[PDB]
Amino acid sequence: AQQEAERARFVVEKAEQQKKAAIISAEGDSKAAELIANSLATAGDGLIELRKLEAAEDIAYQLSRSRNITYLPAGQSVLLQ
Amino acid sequence: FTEAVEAKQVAQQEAERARFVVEKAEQQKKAAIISAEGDSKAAELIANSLATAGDGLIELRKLEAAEDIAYQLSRSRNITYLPAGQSVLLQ
Amino acid sequence: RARFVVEKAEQQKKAAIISAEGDSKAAELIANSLATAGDGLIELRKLEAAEDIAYQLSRSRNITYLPAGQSVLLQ
Amino acid sequence: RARFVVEKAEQQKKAAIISAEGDSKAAELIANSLATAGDGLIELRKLEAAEDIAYQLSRSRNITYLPAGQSVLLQL
Amino acid sequence: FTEAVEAKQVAQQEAERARFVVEKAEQQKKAAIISAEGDSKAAELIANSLATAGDGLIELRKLEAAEDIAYQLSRSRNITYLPAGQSVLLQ
Amino acid sequence: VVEKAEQQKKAAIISAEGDSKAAELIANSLATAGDGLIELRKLEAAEDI
Amino acid sequence: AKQVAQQEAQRAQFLVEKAKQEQRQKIVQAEGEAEAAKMLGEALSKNPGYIKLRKIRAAQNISKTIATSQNRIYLTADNLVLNLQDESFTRGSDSLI
Amino acid sequence: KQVAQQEAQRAQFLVEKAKQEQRQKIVQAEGEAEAAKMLGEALSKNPGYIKLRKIRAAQNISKTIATSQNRIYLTADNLVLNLQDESFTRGSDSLI
Amino acid sequence: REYTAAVEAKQVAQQEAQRAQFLVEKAKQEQRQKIVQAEGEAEAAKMLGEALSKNPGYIKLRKIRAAQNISKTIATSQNRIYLTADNLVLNLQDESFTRGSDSLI
Amino acid sequence: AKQVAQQEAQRAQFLVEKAKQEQRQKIVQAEGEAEAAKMLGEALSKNPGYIKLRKIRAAQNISKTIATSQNRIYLTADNLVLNLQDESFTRGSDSLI
Amino acid sequence: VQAEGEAEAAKMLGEALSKNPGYIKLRKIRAAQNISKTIATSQNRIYLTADNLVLNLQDESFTRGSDSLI
């Protein structure tokens, strides 16, 4: 009875707020994509090339402190030290 | 002989038990209809929006899903990532 | 022996008839719905079956997954 | 002794033609039905047999399944 | 109840903290624009020269950087060189 | 070995005649009926092997 | 011996009845599938993007399962999206045109 | 020659066994023929049924091998995790 | 005797059918959840589709950002990870070096 | 029980407020990024050599990083530029031609 | 002496087999069985193909034999 009323309010509120969080994040992504698309449409992908280069620098840094990461030269066979 | 008669009786009772299983299956059919309606309604909403929007939503969902999967599988020593077109090595 | 063979022949034939009825009646129904509607149901069932299979095999220590193309050496 | 061997060969011929007769009767029933119908039964039986075979081999410790081609490995 | 009150207040304070993240993000936007200007001025100078000179430096700089990289990586036992397109067993 | 080989020639001709009579019977029946028997026999032998 | 086996065959007669009950179960499930096929296939015949999104969701659900699995999983590093310098990097956006 | 006498008797027993085998064999074929007509007509309109059956077969096999003592090396395209390859859309592409 | 225990098992089977009735109600709840998520996705799809159809490239930047987030994640993971050395951009002399600048022009 | 559930839903209300602030974070980044796009694309439209040069510097920066890493690295011997007899030796100069 | 035996054998067998060499196919099947019985007690290490077990019902070769009959 009381728990059923609680459940009605809880489930409706939970679904409502989950959808609204999705709406807000979708609107944010849409507006960000709008800002990016309208500029790149006239500028080109030079920005993206620079972003990839510096992202490679950052990724190499982030994975420098880990003995679980190993880099391999595309095509290679078996060894282990 | 007695054990064959006993097993025969067991099979008779099991046939009625299968009737109970069928009742479960008919309730499961009702539940399956409900879930099928849910899938159909969801597919309808999404299909109508994507018919004019395109697959941009799907691309973003794939990117964030890759992030989520990498996170979800981070606490797992039984998972090893290998590069596409590798070779041979154990460790 | 022949009497037992004949009783089992009757019962196996009747079970086969029952199975044929069940399968031909499961078809028709499904086949007609899929004659009108597409294979969307097939693909959706594949997806949820993949989830279910992943779950069913999740507790085995003698099942392993390998990348699609390339054997290596495992540990 | 050799006479019994020859008699066995004759009895084996008789048994062989009994079995072959049964094979041809089965083939006749099934061939006529499938000619009218199609191979839908064949596909269904293959699926059922796949389930059955997986079950029959499930208790063996001598069977290893390898992933659709694939070359060399060893899991330690 | 006797934790959830605080938890919703924590989420409220996390929203306020995210607003402060926006403040530092405004400053990050300023810094990013400055660095973007740096890259665009550098790219402008270099493009104006190379468009008339040819690649030139790019080949020379690749040679110099090969020397530099080999030198920097010389002090490491975690780095090894394998022949191009060819297999190696640990020896 | 030569003495044995003369007797072997006799035995070889006998067995070759047997093989040719078997081949005659089987070749006639297969020429008119088809080679379905052989496919069936392959399956039977797969189980036996 | 044979008469005991004949009584086992009488049990098998009840197992034939059991098979008939199994048949009804199978037909009921098939009816559910037919109704689902009409409803769902209609929607997906316009645009199957739902399936795509569902596949994405399936990936996530599967990752939650195998994250606590006893299985040994070797998995392509392409799932880490770390190789920004390959040709695959742009394919997604290229698909969007 | 006593062994040979017994072996001749065993050959006769095998003749009777073959008679029983023929009876059983024919009856099973009879059931299969009836099933072939009924099922084949339905599947000739749309074999999607067996597609579903195949899916269900996989699930049954899964449940079996989950308890099995066999060593099983599966492919990583099971566990659909590679959202970035061409197989991601393939299913919906065939749906169209 | 033993078949009255069989009857008790049948009573449990009837209760399992009642649990299937429960599952019918549970399926109703699940249907509503799916519908709510689908509405969220449909609205998101319209908004994102407009912007991304004008010019994809937000996707590329988001993918770069995703690579960075993943690198931070896996840097502290328990996974054994074999990457390709091409991620280090050290081979300055090959045909892939100019690839990005070639894409620009 | 009743209130732990409902107040976690209210916590979700505040997580929606947090999502509003997260939205603004993403928009700030997009604004700055759009400005960068304009400047850089125009500068690189005449010649993308800057990218090439930065790529070279990226290599150098990465080589400084990995030189002190715990990471295990297998590189190609072609980075050492030692095979003077290789048919790719002239490639760079051939590009200059 | 052996060559004389082979010449006679060739005349008889060549005549019969020229009508339908399926006899050989049947003989080949029997050879398999005989070889099996031999190698079943052999000291040799034998690596065979799993296709001998006919277990793969999903392979395209499954119908091959019946396709030959068509």
Whether chain F lies against chain B with 3 or more Cβ pairs closer than 8 A is: no
Give the C-alpha distances (Å, rounded to integers) separating G84 from B68, E69, J53: 19, 21, 18
Q: Which of G93, A28, G85, B58 is nearest to I59 (CA)?
A: G93
Say yes or no: A77 contacts chain B, CB-CB below 8 A.
yes
Q: Which chains touch I (3 or more CB pairs under 8 A)?
A: A, B, E, G, J
Question: Is residue I81 classed as helix, strand or coil in its secondary structure?
Answer: strand
| B78 phi/psi in degrees, rounded to 5 | -85, 5
Residues 22-81 of J with CB under 8 A from E: 22, 24-25, 28-29, 31-33, 35-36, 39-40, 42-44, 46-50, 52-53, 56-57, 59-60, 63-64, 66-81
Please report, as a single letter, which amino acid is at residue D74.
L
Cα–Cα dist A13/A54, whole Å? 43
Distance (Å) from the alpha carbon of E84 to chain J's nearest alpha carbon: 6
Please report, as a single letter, which amino acid is at residue E52.
T
Order of all β-strands in the sheet with J72-76: D64-65, H71-75, C63-66, G72-76, B79-82, I80-84, A69-72, J72-76, E79-82
Contacts of F5 (CB under 8 A, 6+ apart): K1, K2
DSSP state of J77: G
Cα–Cα dist F10/G24, whole Å? 71
Give the resolution in Å. 2.8
Place of tokens 């030198």: E71
Q: How far is CA A64 from the centre of its chain?
A: 22
Distance (Å) from the alpha carbon of C34 to chain G's nearest alpha carbon: 6
In chain A, helix, strand, coil percent, each to 5? 75, 5, 20
Question: Is residue A1 classed as helix, strand or coil in its secondary structure?
Answer: coil
Q: How many CB atoms lie within 10 A of CB C44?
A: 27
3-state secondary structure chain E: CCCHHHHHHHHHHHHHHHHHHHHHHHHHHHHHHHHHHHHHHHHHHHHHHHHHHCCCHHHHHHHHHHHHHHHHHCCCCCEEEECCCCCCCCC
Q: Do the Cβ atoms of H65 and C58 come closer than 8 Å? A: no
Q: Do the Cβ atoms of J16 and E11 come closer than 8 Å? A: no
Q: Do the Cβ atoms of J26 and I58 come closer than 8 Å? A: no
DSSP state of D46: H
Q: How many CB atoms lie within 10 A of CB C3?
A: 12
Q: Which of J16, D46, E59, E85 is nearest to H47 (CA)?
A: D46
Cα–Cα dist A17/K60, whole Å? 53
For I82, nearest residue in chain B (alpha carbons): B82
Q: Do the Cβ atoms of G37 and C41 come closer than 8 Å? A: yes
Please report, as a single letter, which amino acid is at residue G10.
Q
Q: Do the Cβ atoms of C25 and G30 come closer than 8 Å? A: yes
- State the pairing for strand pair D64-65/H71-75: parallel
| DSSP conformation letters of chain H | -HHHHHHHHHHHHHHHHHHHHHHHHHHHHHHHHHHHHHHHHHHHH-THHHHHHHHHHHHHHHHHHHH--SEEEEETTSS---TTSTHHHHHHHHH-
Phi-psi group of I89: left, alpha or beta (phi > 0 → left; psi -120 to 50 → alpha; rest → beta): left
Q: How many CB atoms lie within 10 A of CB I3?
A: 14
User: Where do the H-state alpha helices sit in D1-76?
Assistant: 2-36, 40-56
Cα–Cα dist H95/I10, whole Å? 43
| A64 phi/psi in degrees, rounded to 5 | -75, -30
Strand partners, G74: B80
Q: How many CB atoms lie within 10 A of CB J60?
A: 19
Q: Which of E27, J32, E87, C5 is nearest to H25 (CA)?
A: C5
Distance (Å) from the alpha carbon of H91 to chain D's nearest alpha carbon: 20
Give the C-alpha distances (Å, rounded to integers) separating H39 from H45, J58, K20: 10, 66, 39
Q: Sign (positive/negative) of CA torsion A10, A14, A17, A20? A: negative
Please report, as a single letter, which amino acid is at residue J49.
G
Cα–Cα dist A65/I21, whole Å? 55
- State the pairing for strand pair H71-75/A69-72: unpaired
Experimental method: cryo-EM
Cα–Cα dist H55/G15, whole Å? 27
| K44 CB burial (10 A radius; 0-12, 13-18, 19+) | exposed
Q: How many CB atoms lie within 10 A of CB J58?
A: 24
Token pair in block for residue H43: 């599947």
Cα–Cα dist A11/A17, whole Å? 10
Q: Do the Cβ atoms of I94 and E62 come closer than 8 Å? A: no
Contacts of J90 (CB under 8 A, 6+ apart): none
Please report, as a single letter, which amino acid is at residue J17.
E
> Do residue G34 and residue C74 have CB atoms under 8 angstroms apart?
no
Cα–Cα dist B26/B31, whole Å? 9
Q: How far is CA I22 from the centre of its chain?
A: 29
Cα–Cα dist K56/K59, whole Å? 6
CB pairs under 8 A between B and C: 23
